[model samples]
Target chain A: KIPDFVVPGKCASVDRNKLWAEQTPNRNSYAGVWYQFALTNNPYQLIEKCVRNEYSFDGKQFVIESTGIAYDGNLLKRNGKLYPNPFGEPHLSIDYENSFAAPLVILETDYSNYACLYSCIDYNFGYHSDFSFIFSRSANLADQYVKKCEAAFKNINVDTTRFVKTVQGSSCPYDTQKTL
Target chain B: DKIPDFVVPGKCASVDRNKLWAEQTPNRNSYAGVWYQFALTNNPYQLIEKCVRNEYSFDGKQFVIESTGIAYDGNLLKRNGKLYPNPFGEPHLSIDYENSFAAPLVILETDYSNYACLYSCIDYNFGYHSDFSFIFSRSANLADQYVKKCEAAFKNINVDTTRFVKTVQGSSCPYDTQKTL
Candidate 1:
């Protein structure tokens, strides 16, 4: 989570614009690749699920489908330039660090809202895999939504009661400034 | 009355015959020194009881430590420097931990509906910050998220969060994490 710069007491010139530039990367690239995210309702259990054949384009419907091949913790030997941050399967796991993560805290309607509570896992890439981050879609979710998610987790043998809640946390500044 | 064959110690009765604990003296309370001064009976999962006295930063607290059937002889103790594993067979800490007027150690157990859950020590300004917070869950996959949650919780409590180094690929553990993946 990006630390929010709160002016402790007023009268402080917090150059938010320059601060934004300093905080955000000048350049970043996106990649379209297969992902195998580990899934579990409870923090105790986790299982990997593979997602492939994501057709990527600039929303013009231009197409590219992944060739059918068995990829399990193995890099695709197929030669093609990854859109950005491209490498092997393990690298995708590394890329996962930059995107978003959160414990599945809430999932009221995965089909309709595409909403869920997520805690991000921090990544130091080569040095260490010990960072943590929690990500969520949009801002608000109902209390029952969280309860429903917790129940679902418990049903799947995950004990939700033990978790310390991260109901409020850091979010990207760029996301807030977008005018769409 | 008739005693059950299993309950009768018989030839095995001699097994449970050692007092693995010694009370602290020369200070009225304290086990900083070691002592093994009693003999015990061996009953499977037998409950053994002992006293616990702890002092830090000038404050002191005491409580009973018990285990069923066996006595623990391990020298290593939790940082509170008091609680020790019960020497009796199955691992069980004395109950009524926090609620017990005298119970005050780093960790202890409490009873659930049909089972007992060991509670970790609460974060206090004094002791080992997160230095001693170790995570153990019923599942292997949880190792990652558990560490994450601990880090998250530690951060909220205004404690240092970086001391936790996740056990990666080939550290020493029964599980295997494809670190490269």
Candidate 2:
């Protein structure tokens, strides 16, 4: 779930499920329409082990094991450091929904591969089957950018046709010099 | 022509008894309306159908739709969904004027964090210091495609689509509502 551009001049808003709704004829839904996927081997606490080794617990409170830590350390020594907390654990996180993607293990550096939170590799068969987005400095994206982004989704086997373009209006909470 | 001599008090904005007004004169309905446009791999027909059917989410922090195709609210996203890129803006949907009847309006607020909106019509009032605002987006969250959607919506409302400049932020700061008709 990579949100390309956040709404300018406002807060990074979200909810446990969907965004709040107002009474209007044309309302925009929230990203809660699509959710993250979780799996076993998270290295976090094991609250209730079921389904043959699947542990369910609070993703936020869950801690990464030493192996997860070492993997990042290796990356830091090689590719430098992650910009926005790659793990998203200590700083960013999901709710109790246990949202995560499978094929869980990822290699941040050349050393080796370990468990990490990334998009599920299995498209058309996982929760992300319907997940995707568009991004740009402006709502008007270049033809190349749109195709490239759509192609990436196609590579992941996501249905590109379902995607829609959002409205292009004034940057809210922002005004021109005349009004300023 | 549909307007009555005396509308129920408070149900609608009051008009002067002996004053000449656009609505009182019965100008063409095409004088102001709405339309929409969009970019998509699917057929425009299908995309338009989804818009009318309400099958997508705007989910960004600065804008929210009243239902599906209508642009509403000018404040922050209602605090839900997953992590996104720029999580520090507000929506602005506040407006008080004659343009409220115009469909698919471009609302303004203090700073994109408050909810304030209005439609388009004559007698625009720019009081209370406008700050935030937003344009419409079709389902699928594609901004570029929404240009077409806006146009289409404009056509639907019988308004002149050429009056809009299509996309506004490609070369400057975000603000497209100021496009002169």
Candidate 3:
């Protein structure tokens, strides 16, 4: 579930040309439970804690079950697709009936351990907005894994300071059996 | 309540040496560290529970494995083993243990980032045989993609994974000194 938490104060310039996508070899690896590790800074800090996603695939389509505390404990289940691009780039587009269709480029994902989610689009004014998220299989990750993610962000020239770490621990509520 | 007897196979089947093996490129660095067991395909150690981990480290030539788990009877079982890379091949591993207890330790698949699956054959005779496989990850949990890949590999090799058991690594599991190897 993409929250409308755009940072209103920042009018920073972001490079769109440098942001590119790669074709993933195995789409099946993207399936399963993922805990939100880090994401670009935004205004939606309230529900940012304990965000998780569970993805399952029927033979023909992909199902994404996103859970968070945005709406006082809310869960959003959406359908997503990795549309094959003729230009030889890997792309992920999530479809939500009433909202805008999110076109995301998977920067990198080994599918087992971690994934980097990227979306770049022109915003109001002269600024271009770039969104990126790092996800992990577990809610809590080792320092080495976190360091690897930080290095990846640094390599792409993205400011690591603004990246907010999601709150994940035993205290957070994770109801897998809850109805949407 | 009824009781069942342990049925042993009548004959030993020949070990198929031409089975698919894990890729060799993911060297010691990719594997070194702690890993949690996510799934097990027909594991004999069904009594073992929570906080299962395989810690690997390189000591000169072979990869040393310090694995630990808690038995259902509340006994802590920690075993040490070694994995020797086949000089003639890339993916094959000759696993040896100094102890009498053994579990099939074959490196079936790994990408280093997400999941690693290993297979082991304890006994392979003409008709009767025993073996087990493990699905592990760097984290206590696993991504869906890795689970699917692991399932596919098991299916490709004619292993039934329908009864695969998930290991418990939740909050209730104690992380005291007992789990450490």
Candidate 4:
């Protein structure tokens, strides 16, 4: 799926899907809130606290949502994968309405603790921008895993530095109001 | 109280706690007081239900500030960053997260007493652009004249002012905490 901005991408692929949930670890349904300590798609990510994502299946399509500044999106799937999907992958596409397409592939993920996602948008002159993320099951994650996720991006030429550390912990305010 | 030469430009210098011309200095510290957001654009926070207070100051060479709308017991911990003179060669404040708040802001105009208009509009060559503006006041209850002036300033700059949602303030706001400065 092309992103709302319409820029496209190019990343390497792996993981025999071996699937987008149904294939991996059992139509692997990630329940509850997944805390995001690092993200590249947002400008307000640093000031943002409790940055997180949620996924649910609506029988027909897979869906994902983020922030209580809430956004709603659903998924579509593809077979072959590519870098940044400049042409298009093993990932499932979502947000059928607005941009955010190409099934936006899943670069790395696990059943219990971590997930690393990738998306690319293309522009003229043959350049592209990435909107990728490093997420943990809890508010904090081991630095080792975070590094591994970053390494995934680098292996495929994604700039890990563009990924900003999100605000989390006791310093955050109004947690009751700031929810997924 | 005529401020002689208030409109003239001079060699910029460090901020003075001196009250006489302190507000006119154009240093980052000039905006270092409690400024309540009067209006904004493309904001996701429920402005009609909440308030964002911007407190600007300098902590050594670093710029320090707090925000209420960001999260917590209502006051965001003071975050430190760097500030530079507005690139347009004005004394306005411009900050990046690499420096402090992580956004580009330049002061449009202010009387140094009652009101200030701040704006950010950065873009990439192939048509990527951002436009955000704020009308701020020293008091929650800025007079209509000063508010009008701030609004006028934005219109003159030719950015969108049509959808600015006035923030909810006054008795609905949390108790005003007194600051030593």
Cα displacement (Å) at residue A156, model 2: 0.9
Q: Model 3, range B144-181, lDDT digits (tens) per residue?
A: 98999989877776666775788887465554564554
Model 3 lDDT at residue B6 = 18
lDDT at position A159, candidate 2: 48
lDDT of 1 by residue, B1-181 (tens): 5632222221111111122112121222332222211111221111122211112221233223321111134121221222422212212221222111111112211111111112222121122111123222232223444445544544543434443333221223212111111
Note the Cα lDDT for every prediction shown. 0.24, 0.24, 0.59, 0.52
- Give the true-contact fraction for every prediction, in order: 0.00, 0.00, 0.00, 0.00
lDDT of 4 by residue, B46-110 (tens): 21234566676776444555555433235433333345433233334445321112234556677
Candidate 1: Cα lDDT at A65: 34
Flag the better candidate by lDDT, 1 or 3. 3
Task: Give interface RMSD (Å), model 3.
Answer: 29.3
Candidate that beats the other on lDDT, 1 or 2, i.e. the better one: 1
Which candidate, 3 or 4, would have the higher DockQ against the true structure?
Answer: 4
Q: How would the candidate models be sorted by lDDT, starting from the highest?
A: 3, 4, 1, 2
Estimate the overall C-alpha local distance difference test score of candidate 4: 0.52
Q: A-chain TM-score per prediction?
A: 0.28, 0.30, 0.71, 0.65
